[PDB]
Amino acid sequence: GIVEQCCTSICSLYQLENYCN
Amino acid sequence: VNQHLCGSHLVEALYLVCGE
């Protein structure tokens, strides 16, 4: 999920945007 | 530059890009 993708690894804007709301 | 986003930095990034 979002912590694995953006915290453990590095995520792009469009990955991050998939978690909006 | 740290490109990882954790904890409240991750929440602030979401607030920024999602606008809420």
Curated annotation (Swiss-Prot), chain A:
<feature type="disulfide bond">
    <location>
        <begin position="6"/>
        <end position="11"/>
    </location>
</feature>
<protein>
    <recommendedName>
        <fullName>Insulin A chain</fullName>
    </recommendedName>
</protein>
